[PDB]
């Protein structure tokens, strides 16, 4: 019994359909496209780590810009909003800076208030009580 591959046409079309948008001979010649289709799938699989990284890099760049409009720096906004028990991430904050500017200035004024309370407490030796916005809500 002599057996031969009868459906080799479909085996190569499921590879070339992903190379249709390439340039040159690696969009129609299996030998060349197969090596570039495999590199595309690897890039797309490793690109899921870059997307998450570049997003957070973008959010921070937009928050940094919106904080300088109010005379603040990125570390002083994020660090002092955490001290006020406000758990808002970079994604939301950058969205607020674009579409809710009046709410973002309220968050910057809060951070500047908590930042100034920290300096005042650093000048005292504990005798003076804590600030109004420096209090921490406890959860049992």
């Amino acid at each position: 019994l002599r057996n031969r591959v009868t459906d080799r046409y479909f085996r190569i079309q499921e590879v070339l359909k992903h190379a249709r948008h390439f340039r040159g001979r690696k969009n129609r010649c299996y030998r060349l496209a197969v090596r570039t289709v495999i590199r595309a799938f690897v890039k797309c699989t490793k690109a899921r780590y870059l997307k998450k990284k570049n997003m957070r890099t973008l959010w921070i760049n937009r928050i940094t810009a919106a904080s300088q409009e109010h005379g603040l720096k990125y570390p002083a906004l994020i660090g002092n909003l955490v001290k006020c028990q406000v758990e808002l991430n970079r994604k939301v904050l950058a969205d607020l800076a674009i579409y809710e500017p009046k709410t973002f200035k309220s968050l910057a004024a809060l951070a500047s208030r908590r930042r100034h309370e920290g300096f005042a407490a650093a000048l005292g030796d504990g005798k003076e009580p804590e600030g109004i916005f420096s209090r921490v809500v406890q959860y049992h």
């Binding site: 997003m55 973008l58 950058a94 969205d95 674009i98 579409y99």
Partner: protein
């Protein structure tokens, strides 16, 4: 071999309605197995592409290439074939819609080289395809002007959104 170009002059369109506009006539014609290169012929079919029937015949009549005398013969017999068979009223009211070249069935002979070496030369052949359309040659597209460049640039500046946000 494929001979679809000759079957396009056999399609019969349904009668047009009274309100529909006059449909231009299309005439397909070709010549097969021309002893000439398709690369050399491509430069001649590219020349008359878009020209009128009477202008193309004038450019091909004073060209020194061999393909010119061949194309001109194909155009003359497609011109007559149009008025005689395809109901074209004026023979000068025609323009070159399509004109290209194709590879033909070629032969293979041996070219002798030195030191008992040899090469394989091919006696090349080609086809010529032309399509004539009734009417005047479509007016050439004017070159893009500064108003269109600026109008397009401002349109790109207005189509830009805020990306990677709500």
């Amino acid at each position: 071999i494929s001979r679809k170009w000759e079957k396009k002059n056999k399609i019969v369109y349904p009668p047009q309605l009274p309100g529909e506009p006059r449909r231009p006539a299309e005439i397909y014609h070709c010549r097969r197995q021309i002893k000439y290169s398709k690369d050399k012929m491509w430069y001649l079919a590219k020349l008359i592409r878009g020209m009128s029937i009477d202008q193309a015949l004038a450019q091909l009549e004073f060209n020194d290439k061999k393909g010119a005398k061949i194309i001109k013969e194909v155009l003359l017999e497609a011109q007559d074939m149009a008025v005689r068979d395809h109901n074209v009223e004026f023979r000068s009211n025609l323009y070159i819609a399509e004109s290209t070249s194709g590879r033909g069935q070629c032969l293979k002979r041996i070219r002798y080289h030195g030191r008992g070496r040899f090469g394989i030369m091919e006696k090349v052949y080609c086809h010529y395809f032309v399509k004539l359309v009734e009417g005047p040659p479509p007016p050439p597209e004017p070159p893009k002007t500064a108003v269109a460049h600026a109008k397009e640039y401002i349109q790109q500046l207005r189509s830009r959104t805020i990306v990677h946000t709500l």
